[PDB]
Amino acid sequence: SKIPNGHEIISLFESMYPKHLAMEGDKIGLQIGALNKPVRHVLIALDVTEEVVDEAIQLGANVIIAHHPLIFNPLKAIHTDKAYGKIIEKCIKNDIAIYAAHTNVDVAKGGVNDLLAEALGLQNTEVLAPTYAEEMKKVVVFVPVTHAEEVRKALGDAGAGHIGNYSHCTFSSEGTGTFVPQEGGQLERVEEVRIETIIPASLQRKVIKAMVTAHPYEEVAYDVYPLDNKGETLGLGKIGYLQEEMTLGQFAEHVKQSLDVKGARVVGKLDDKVRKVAVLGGDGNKYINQAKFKGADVYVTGDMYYHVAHDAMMLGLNIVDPGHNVEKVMKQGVQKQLQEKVDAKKLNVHIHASQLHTDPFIFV
Amino acid sequence: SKIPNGHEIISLFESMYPKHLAMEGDKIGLQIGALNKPVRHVLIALDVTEEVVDEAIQLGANVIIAHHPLIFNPLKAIHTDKAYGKIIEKCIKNDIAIYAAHTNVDVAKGGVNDLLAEALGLQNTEVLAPTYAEEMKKVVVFVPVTHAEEVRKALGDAGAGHIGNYSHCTFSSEGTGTFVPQQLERVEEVRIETIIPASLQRKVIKAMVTAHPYEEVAYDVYPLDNKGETLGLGKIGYLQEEMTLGQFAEHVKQSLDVKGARVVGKLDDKVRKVAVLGGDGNKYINQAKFKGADVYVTGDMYYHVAHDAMMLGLNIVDPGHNVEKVMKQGVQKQLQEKVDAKKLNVHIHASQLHTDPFIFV
Amino acid sequence: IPNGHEIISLFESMYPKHLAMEGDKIGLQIGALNKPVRHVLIALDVTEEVVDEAIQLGANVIIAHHPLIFNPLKAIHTDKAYGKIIEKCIKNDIAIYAAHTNVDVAKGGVNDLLAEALGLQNTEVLAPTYAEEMKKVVVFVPVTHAEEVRKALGDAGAGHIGNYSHCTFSSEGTGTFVPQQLERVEEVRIETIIPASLQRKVIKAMVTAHPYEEVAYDVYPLDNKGETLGLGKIGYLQEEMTLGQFAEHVKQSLDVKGARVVGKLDDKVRKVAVLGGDGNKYINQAKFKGADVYVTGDMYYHVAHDAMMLGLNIVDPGHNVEKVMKQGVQKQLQEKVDAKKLNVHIHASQLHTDPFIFV
Amino acid sequence: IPNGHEIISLFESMYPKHLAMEGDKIGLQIGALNKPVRHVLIALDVTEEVVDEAIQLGANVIIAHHPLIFNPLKAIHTDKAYGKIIEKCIKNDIAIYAAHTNVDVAKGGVNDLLAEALGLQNTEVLAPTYAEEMKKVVVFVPVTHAEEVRKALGDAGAGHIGNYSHCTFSSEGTGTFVPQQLERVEEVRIETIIPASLQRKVIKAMVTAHPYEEVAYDVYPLDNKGETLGLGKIGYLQEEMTLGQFAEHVKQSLDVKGARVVGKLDDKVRKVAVLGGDGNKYINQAKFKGADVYVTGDMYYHVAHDAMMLGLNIVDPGHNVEKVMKQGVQKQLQEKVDAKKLNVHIHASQLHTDPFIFV
Ligand SMILES: [Zn+2]
Ligand SMILES: [Zn+2]
Ligand SMILES: [Zn+2]
Ligand SMILES: [Zn+2]
Ligand SMILES: [Zn+2]
Ligand SMILES: [Zn+2]
Ligand SMILES: [Zn+2]
Ligand SMILES: [Zn+2]
Incomplete structure (x- = not known):
């Protein structure tokens, strides 16, 4: 077995999630550090918070593959006195490479949205919004x-x-x-x-x-x-069919158990029947028209805005919002996929799925 | 025979004037109402003024297909106390659907420009501005x-x-x-x-x-x-015989049935190749002239554009934008012919109201 | 005795208009081309001195590498130096034709000329366009x-x-x-x-x-x-030389009294990129293509620091070094006109138009 | 033993932030200021060598005239020269404070320093801001x-x-x-x-x-x-000199081995405009204010031709000539800190950061 460098690992990740799949104006790739160095351990993350970086240090991981870019707005400054600047500082001081895989993981087969469709038990899925x-x-x-x-x-x-x-x-x-x-x-x-x-x-x-x-x-x-x-x-989100018809109220429960969340917000009458379901992990406010045009009975997405939700009731579209953080399924998912590729190529790397919970919200 | 719904009528109309033909940024299609309803009478209009709405109401027409979009600037409000908001209110309250057919009617074969060219007697016409x-x-x-x-x-x-x-x-x-x-x-x-x-x-x-x-x-x-x-906007073709600019301007008044026109150029200049483009054709004086036009017929001719024309050596006859009115009987014939072929009992009417705002004195 | 149109048609078969970049200002800038033409003047910059040379030659067309009108004219002020250049072109019926980035791009163009002047072997295009x-x-x-x-x-x-x-x-x-x-x-x-x-x-x-x-x-x-086809050329010197001697070799080759160098005079140089004019935009392409050194004009301070950080050396002989295009185009255009048996003389402006004197 | 905050407060009373131009990038760029500070390094450009000097000095604040981060960072690439400058500032807790156009504008600023270095009398602001x-x-x-x-x-x-x-x-x-x-x-x-x-x-x-x-x-x-207050200064030499000697006087005064001159070396010079950095934008103001010659860096070709057409001479000693601001600010900042009885040492970077070597 050979200990690979960052470039090799990244090159094998991109075989599954190519950069041309990323959307207009998305921020992906190496964001912090260098990849031309021996990599014995890698961490898959959703959000690169400081606690996630502490985890990478306790594991010996010098590369974190994250779904949400750590640098999204370009840096005008690095303030080490502030929580955010301290994350960049902790990464730099500890020679930790930060790689972003954002919309390319949303769009690609086996990505966030497939992982969420499977989790929900959806069958005969199709791309929701072609990109x-x-x-x-x-x-x-x-x-x-x-x-x-x-x-x-x-x-x-x-x-x-x-x-x-x-x-x-x-x-x-x-x-x-x-x-x-x-x-x-x-x-x-x-x-x-x-x-x-x-x-x-x-x-x-x-x-x-x-x-x-x-x-x-x-x-x-x-x-x-x-x-x-x-x-x-290829595109954002999946639309498919439940195994059996349910009301919105019980579908919503199914979303909670199924996606491991304590609470959700629901738009629509809880006693309406739902059979075909649209899901789009992350902010899917922009795809309510698509979801209805394609015939969804209910739409599962995060960050639902008040006005968009009134727009959805007017379309006749139900919504369950389990939170943007349900994209966390992508850590264990990418961890499997990637471990599988590095094992197929005799590489001596252990891939890890961050255990830390990064949902900023608590339902009370 | 049976009574069609609006969507069926609109399909037939759109088979002649495909929507993809419209200019980028144009406002076309259903603008007010719904089309999933029985339609016994359809009214063809250039402009949807309040009297055109009164005319449809009187004919029992619950669909108006108009060349000029009733809504061009998107609406920030519907002020039923103003004349424009009264038109909208009237359509809504009487369940009249308003459908726009704008630049697709200018671009398509058999459309505004083919009609104006046929009315002028032009031979061997070609598209003036390819689109x-x-x-x-x-x-x-x-x-x-x-x-x-x-x-x-x-x-x-x-x-x-x-x-x-x-x-x-x-x-x-x-x-x-x-x-x-x-x-x-x-x-x-x-x-x-x-x-x-x-x-x-x-x-x-x-x-x-x-x-x-x-x-x-x-x-x-x-x-x-x-x-x-x-396909494209405007036609360019030839007169059967040569004439002066003044004789040709009189030909325009007779052909397109207008009482006055404005002419740019020497009335004694000879004309043989004519370009025509209904509506606002200011932006095409160059194209007209690159194609050998002795004279260009269009509406809304503007001062500095007329001066640009003189410099190019291109004569112009402006009979007004309203000469696009020929589209009303044109579309009516085309559409009535279509609906009769499919055996739909629906009467297509052409608006009889004169909508030119200008009177020559 | 031909038209400006026929002479410019021959020029364009060698330097097509589609070769030019995005917002380039080319073609006939001042005057008319449907006039008999006996003499043609090739220039880099249309200065008032170059217009006088044309008048003295009896040339009624000036083909210039730098557009005389780059910014569109809001006025023509005749008591200003710029308006006076325009004034006398008009008064002496001299037509000004602009040939800009098409001459930077086409074969035998400004960059082919500089490369051959530097004695570069196995040249390839630097930046494809x-x-x-x-x-x-x-x-x-x-x-x-x-x-x-x-x-x-x-x-x-x-x-x-x-x-x-x-x-x-x-x-x-x-x-x-x-x-x-x-x-x-x-x-x-x-x-x-x-x-x-x-x-x-x-x-x-x-x-x-x-x-x-x-x-x-x-x-x-x-x-x-x-x-x-593209901008600049990248190629090789016949033999390795220090950055310091390559810099002299640039002054000898391009006939300039001075040059500014970025990098260590002592380190070795073999692969050279060259781009006439303002080539600040291309330092990255130059380094990526393996250039040991890049010859270009108008190098800006902060871009020299960037060059340094890339590990890319620079010799900056000035933008005027594109003067080669004058005898270059004259030779190429005289050959076209003679083959068509046209009785016209193509002259290359002799005037030195570098504003900079090195002290 | 003071904070970076107290030392930067004293600096700002001399170089206020509101003096800076439209989209200037000033203030704390990297690091924190709520840290004890014993040594401060004043620099022009924050090069990796300047960061090493700081480390060697035990300085944990670098006040630089040129912003280290000018374009916002989409990434910090540690195997690239630029990312490495950023990397070691972070790893050695060096704070980088940017002082750009406020230092170009304020009294005793870059342009006051150049004017006094050139021995200019009765100076007035060139371009009011x-x-x-x-x-x-x-x-x-x-x-x-x-x-x-x-x-x-x-x-x-x-x-x-x-x-x-x-x-x-x-x-x-x-x-x-x-x-x-x-x-x-x-x-x-x-x-x-x-x-x-x-x-x-x-x-x-x-x-x-x-x-x-x-x-x-x-x-x-x-x-x-x-x-x-504004950009640059316009003033007079104590005595008339030819453009050629004024040019030497610039090399002697600003300690540069070379300079590029626009204009006739033989014509006379008395009123001088100076603007450190990139002063291409200001040739018109310079001529209008009666300057017989304008000293500035980064002069672009076409702007030299414009200068020529205006009848405005230029001496271009390079943008690096703003180095004067290093000992300038050090002296001014040491005086403030000593008056407040603070036990801090202000050092002026000794490193030569001009990328250009004249051949
Ligand atoms: Zn997301
Ligand atoms: Zn996502
Ligand atoms: Zn029309
Ligand atoms: Zn119209
Ligand atoms: Zn040039
Ligand atoms: Zn050029
Ligand atoms: Zn500067
Ligand atoms: Zn400055």
């Missing part, structure tokens, strides 16, 4: 029949032609290519195979490199066509 | 050899592959496909390609997929550089 | 004429990529059609790549050679890019 | 105590204008009141001018001296202005 759809490309490559099969394998293994429940999708037809080699007017002609395969733009670099390697030629002719086809839609 | 080109797509589908022939009929039956004097154009290549369901798998397939305008995309792709074996169809949609017809 | 679009042309042809069509396509310049020319790929298949009972024909689908700019010419040649009046062809946008 | 507000205080007093009240007013600093002190104007008249039938009394209306800053002190003294518990007084805003 990202990968641009698709058609790669067409020309290869002699001697190397055609080898080139298809390389494209496939590298992830090209992986749409739905089928992988290694390609199409090949035979034809003739012409060329006139130049200085360094003789018309040549060669029977060839035209191989085409679809790719998501993010896989372009890796797929082209594998293709070129397998290809017997040094100078390779291939085309990349942009297509109108989009990849799987 | 929309339909985009073409190449559709490529993979069908097993056994149903390839059917899929091509299917695609061609929905109009894909109409190139000049030929129809049902598709090209098919024999090849081999590979895939792995989650082992080495090969199928002999046919790659079929056909060209469609983007409007036919949803239709053609239904007729392809439904007529396809796997139903979990492998197909690609390529954007092409090839474009379809161009 | 343009890449020409490529398209895929696909045409359907009966077998009997496929070869004629491919030849037309290649002779016209399609499929000219890398060390190869006349590259096409043809597949045989079935085309169906119902002439105004589906008819079917064996056909050839020929595809070939083109740069966007060759489209009209290639299509025209392909159509002429096609056996039919109705030609079915498609033009696809590709993500493939043509050649990359 | 601040003028203290004046108020008129009017108080009503019975005749028997009018004189006591006026004396209180003057001893407290009211009516101190020009070469005069204790200036008041008193009028006699009738005051009416209905105590909780109008009552009337002969009274004196005393008026006097004050600077806005003396208000609390003056009012407090006036009230104490007034014979009554209820004091009727008014404070009026006036358009009268106090002393004007």
Whole structure:
């Protein structure tokens, strides 16, 4: 086993939560410290409070992966006399790296919103509010029949032609290519195979490199066509169906047990029937129209504003607000996912899920 | 025959004047009321003044389709003591729905500008200010050899592959496909390609997929550089015979039925190529002139813009913005023709009220 | 005896307007171009002295690297030095054409000139700004004429990529059609790549050679890019030198009496980035591309400190060092005009316009 | 043994925060000030070397002319040179206080220092930025105590204008009141001018001296202005010199190895404008105020051409020439701290932080 550096770990985290998934104006990535150093232990956090930093010190963790950015507004100053400046100071003095994974963990499959849908027992889920759809490309490559099969394998293994429940999708037809080699007017002609395969733009670099390697030629002719086809839609929140119909009052209880909270606020008549549920961890005030358009009976989200809640009653949308802190499910979730990746790659790192409770609110 | 609801009528209207054609920032669509109600009479209006509302009420029209949005500036208040708030109040209290059809009516074929150009007698008209080109797509589908022939009929039956004097154009290549369901798998397939305008995309792709074996169809949609017809604001075309600027200005008054007009340019100058754009066309004097217009017909001509026109060497006849009134009988005919085809018993009316605020003296 | 229009058309084929950056002020700034033109003056800055030189030469067009009108004019004040430059251009019918960042970007431009003047080897673009679009042309042809069509396509310049020319790929298949009972024909689908700019010419040649009046062809946008152009160049000295001697080498090469240096005169230098004009924006790109030193003008204090923190050395010979573009463009434009057998003389302003004197 | 707070309070009485320009970044940038402080380091730029000097001195406060944090931090990257400066300030509990344009503006500031270093006579502010507000205080007093009240007013600093002190104007008249039938009394209306800053002190003294518990007084805003402060200084050399010798005189006076000059080395120079830092914005003001030459740093090419067109000469010794503010402020701050009998040592960074070396 090898002790990895921060960059390697981070590079394996980003395989599951890429930075292009993050939303317009979001603040993610390395925020404090450096990653070019041996990392024996990592901490997954929701909020980087001072008590969370104390925890990282008692564990020997020199990298904290947090969901909410520690620096959100850019720092005009670092006041060590203040609670906030003391967190940055504690991180800096103790060589602790702080990495933010914000909206990219909200948007990605297996992220906050999937974790909350599972927790709730929701079935047949769909993205609630689409924010990202990968641009698709058609790669067409020309290869002699001697190397055609080898080139298809390389494209496939590298992830090209992986749409739905089928992988290694390609199409090949035979034809003739012409060329006139130049200085360094003789018309040549060669029977060839035209191989085409679809790719998501993010896989372009890796797929082209594998293709070129397998290809017997040094100078390779291939085309990349942009297509109108989009990849799987990704976005904020999930909308799905409960296993059985319930009233809002008992659904609300189910949210409490299910999401481990002592209290919640509910908008709507507690005796109304609810079957399809929308959930969006964090501040989801902006998606009440989407939730209703998609047909939700109830919407589970945090930070519900008074005026937005009147807007929701007017739409005919029920709401259960278990608090923004229910996104805490992301710690144990990311901890599993990440431990799994570092174990698959023989790395000697222990990942931890912060135990500290960081909900600023107590229901009385 | 049966009585339609507002949404059915509005669908038919929108098939001729698609909403996507409106300028960014325009205010179009349902502005007041609801459309999920029976509609026996519809009134077509340019401006929704209070008398137009009295006219609908009198006809029993519970939908008014208007060219100029009743609500343009969003409402901070509804002051029923002011004339504007009285109009809104009147619509609300008599359950009249107001629907706006603004720049989409200026941009579409058969719209305001085609109507004004036809009224002026213009030949060989072209779009004055391009705003929309339909985009073409190449559709490529993979069908097993056994149903390839059917899929091509299917695609061609929905109009894909109409190139000049030929129809049902598709090209098919024999090849081999590979895939792995989650082992080495090969199928002999046919790659079929056909060209469609983007409007036919949803239709053609239904007729392809439904007529396809796997139903979990492998197909690609390529954007092409090839474009379809161009749409935009205003028309530019030619008079049947040459005339002076003064004769042409008199032609405008007769054609568009106005009592006075304002002319910029020498009345003795000869005119042959005419540009026209109903409404406020100040921003297009340059475009008019770049296209060889001897004279531009538009409304709301402003001082410094008229002086800009003189400098360019472009003559202008301003018969007023109100000449867009031609849209009332135009849309009425188009819409009554449509509703009668679908067998809906609804009467479409054109507002008989003169709404030009200006009187020439 | 040609027009300004024909002479500027030849200039633009070498320095296209689309190469220019976001809010650049290029093109005809003062005057008219539909006038007979016997002499053309190439300049960096249009100073009143440069306008006098033009008058003395009998030149009625000045092509300048720096736009005379950069900020739009709220007035033309004739008792002010600036209004007087404008005044005499007008009174002596001198047309002022601006060629700014297109000359910074294009081949043989300001940065190619500085790089070759510094003796840099294996140069690459520093900061990419343009890449020409490529398209895929696909045409359907009966077998009997496929070869004629491919030849037309290649002779016209399609499929000219890398060390190869006349590259096409043809597949045989079935085309169906119902002439105004589906008819079917064996056909050839020929595809070939083109740069966007060759489209009209290639299509025209392909159509002429096609056996039919109705030609079915498609033009696809590709993500493939043509050649990359940009700002500045990064390359290598033939031999390693200290920062101190490289700095002298810059003064000798670019003929400047002085230069300001950021970094240790004693440390070693081999890879050099250069960008004429104000290149404060690009220190990061320079360091990232591996430059041991960056030659640029107008270096600001706080940006020199940033450069230092990056571990990037600087030699600042002044922005005026772009003067190379004067004899550069003159040579390139005289070659174009002579090839077109036009009787015009292109002159490069001789006037020194660096405001700075080093003490 | 004092706090950072008490030491910074003394600094601010000399360099107030309100003097600073629009979007300036001043005040405590990193650290805390409620810590015992034995040594203070004055710096221009907070480079990693300057932080090391502080550590070596045992200084836990650095007052710098250039804000260490100018652009707000989106991150603190510890493997980057900039993040490392920030890292060690934090790890060694060094507080970084920024004193920017208030030090450019205040008396004895960067521009007073440069002017006196150049030996300029009869200096005036170049570009006005601040003028203290004046108020008129009017108080009503019975005749028997009018004189006591006026004396209180003057001893407290009211009516101190020009070469005069204790200036008041008193009028006699009738005051009416209905105590909780109008009552009337002969009274004196005393008026006097004050600077806005003396208000609390003056009012407090006036009230104490007034014979009554209820004091009727008014404070009026006036358009009268106090002393004007601003950017740069304009003044005269003791004797006329050529532009070439003035340029040497600048290198000798400001201890710089090089300078860039705009203008003819041979023409005559007498009135000089100076502005430390980046003074590109002010060439117009300099010329309008009659400067025969303008000393400033960071001169940009196109702005030198503008200067030329104005007929304004320039000597550019670099922005680093503001280093004078280091021993300047140290001297001024040591004098304040010693007067308050505080046992603190103020040190001026010895490190040379000019990134430019002239070749
Ligand atoms: Zn959150
Ligand atoms: Zn979140
Ligand atoms: Zn209109
Ligand atoms: Zn209108
Ligand atoms: Zn330049
Ligand atoms: Zn340049
Ligand atoms: Zn400064
Ligand atoms: Zn300063």
